Amino acid sequence: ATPADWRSQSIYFLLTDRFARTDGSTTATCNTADQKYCGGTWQGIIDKLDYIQGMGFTAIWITPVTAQLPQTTAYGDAYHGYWQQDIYSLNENYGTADDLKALSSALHERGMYLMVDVVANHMGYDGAGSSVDYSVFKPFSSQDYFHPFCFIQNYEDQTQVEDCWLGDNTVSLPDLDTTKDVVKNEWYDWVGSLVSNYSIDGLRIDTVKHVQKDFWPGYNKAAGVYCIGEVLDGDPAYTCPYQNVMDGVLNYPIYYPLLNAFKSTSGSMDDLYNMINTVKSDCPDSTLLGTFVENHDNPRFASYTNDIALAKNVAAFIILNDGIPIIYAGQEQHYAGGNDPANREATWLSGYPTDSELYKLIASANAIRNYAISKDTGFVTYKNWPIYKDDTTIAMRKGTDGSQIVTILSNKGASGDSYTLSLSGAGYTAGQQLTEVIGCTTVTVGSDGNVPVPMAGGLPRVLYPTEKLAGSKICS
Ligand SMILES: [Ca+2]
Ligand SMILES: [Ca+2]
Known part of the structure; x- marks a missing residue:
């Protein structure tokens, strides 16, 4: 649950919908361009635990678990879990409150930690923010719980970046007013009970730069386990300071120069040596950041270069740098999807080979790391x-x-x-x-x-x- 404890972990980040199906299929179609539920579930995951584990991972990060808007919107289904409407209920597409139980259970039983992604900035709704029916949200059933309708036009403007709505005229994301003791109150309450009920070890938090600074501390204290937040900014001067309000943040400041050093034979090694030192000196505890080169919001590595030597180099950087190593499901099979939705490929379609080149590299780098820390x-x-x-x-x-x-x-x-x-x-x-x-x-x-x-x-x-x-x- 502990920051100090999450220091020795290494995470496998997967999209529930796209990792493993309950019928263990490896061929069910999953077209990304369609953006619909492909069928992954929490049972599929429990069933492929040896696959994760044999890469040497010690924990997994899974996408949000709350009950989503039900419609198929113009932009697809809520297969990613980031458009919730009801937080006291689960997304029935992944399974049951029992299933979510078994998993936390199969993990814990194998010495693994369970990390769950959570949203607090907003809700999701199929339509124009202007016509929203706040009566569907549970429990934020009135627009009184929400900042008034506006869209962020300028992101260099931090008050509008935190108080206006993300999304658009097509899929709107009602923005909560986390300034009010009520919003807060409920949110602190929920986080805390959710953690208790499924026994999870850490939280990955979405859209942290969208909530004013002051909500987080109590968020993080209520949760009672390590919180690592998403601050989508490459400037250490903008991102690092959140470490002052929650245990860790994802290493976006390292992401940009890392990708740039290895994406080409002409990548700059200086920018990376230099960024490694900046984060070491200016971030509160570089040892609580999460290192990553791939996630579901950026083109995958192999979209930039098909060279496996380069792929092998960035995977070993991330496992051996300071912080918690995070590898995105598909990276190990060398997937090459570009921007969303192309970077949300189903892992099952590769067949889950344990003799893949990146599988073996990753396994033997986790090995040394695991033992050194022994x-x-x-x-x-x-x-x-x-x-x-x-x-x-x-x-x-x-x-x-x-x-x-x-x-x-x-x-x-x-x-x-x-x-x-x-x-x-x-x-x-x-x-x-x-x-x-x-x-x-x-x-x-x-x-x-x-x-x-x-x-x-x-x-x-x-x-x-x-x-x-x-x-x-x-x-x-
Ligand atoms: Ca906000
Ligand atoms: Ca996000």
């Missing part, structure tokens, strides 16, 4: 530090002196020449034996402390003291 209680709080950078390389170091992992990432791609990198600044002793745990090869520390790192095929390299791998299963 043996270095300082790892989750040691701040990642870029020790080196070149036009096609960056290398970082995290973990207590003596038990430190040194990751070497590169953007040379699936060609990328074969040459030796003499990496200085690792801080391993001379003559010490290191294991590259991705490829399970060994290298020996210099004499001068330099590590002759063998590079090829633009592959990521992750080093760790061979000695420290022991009663370890990492490379046998």
Whole structure:
């Protein structure tokens, strides 16, 4: 439930509707352009727990659970869960309050945490904000519970960004006035009981920049478990300060330079080394941010480049950076959907192969991370530090002196020449034996402390003291 506890977790983010069906189908059609319920359920999930778990994940984040407007709107169905009308009732398309129960239960039983996405900024309604029937919302049954109708025309304007409505003339999202002790009151109450009732460990919160700053603290205190919020802004100067009002925020400041460093063979490694330091110095606790390169609101990685060397590099950055690693369902199967709705593909259609290239990379990076933290209680709080950078390389170091992992990432791609990198600044002793745990090869520390790192095929390299791998299963 705890911030301090969520520090050692790694999350699999899935859209309930699109991860796993109850009949375990792997072929049922799911056309994204149609934007309708495809059929995923909470039972399908419980049924594919070994698939998540064998990638080394320790928790899953699932989309909102509240009862949605019922219509098929001009923009599709509420399959994503972000247009609620009734929060004391569940979206019957995913299952039953029992099902939601079993899942929290299968998870907990396997040592996993359950994170649930929640909305507080708004409701959803099929029509013009002007004709809304506030009598459908439960419990916000009067327009008196809502800011008056206006749409955000300028986002650089923060009071209108928080007080006007998101959405449009087609699908309107009635904006609550969270300023009133009533809105508040009910919202604090609800969050708290919801958590209790299904036993979830953390909350992912939507549209945080749309609610004025002051609502959150009590939101976060009432919930009683870790809250990570969505602040959709790339400026650390705008986003980080929310850390002053809730445990963590999603790493959007790192997202933009990370994508840009690995999306091309010419990506800038400077912008990323630089952003890694800025977030480390200016954000309250970089160790409580969530790292990500893909989600359902942005084109997937492989839409920008089909190179698997590059895909392999960004996946290993996210698992090994400071914070909670988050991988979006489909990333591991190299899905390449573009903007919404193309980036909400059903995971089942890949067949759920555990021998996929990104599946294996992800699994072997979660492996090391999971073990290091078994043996270095300082790892989750040691701040990642870029020790080196070149036009096609960056290398970082995290973990207590003596038990430190040194990751070497590169953007040379699936060609990328074969040459030796003499990496200085690792801080391993001379003559010490290191294991590259991705490829399970060994290298020996210099004499001068330099590590002759063998590079090829633009592959990521992750080093760790061979000695420290022991009663370890990492490379046998
Ligand atoms: Ca608002
Ligand atoms: Ca959102």
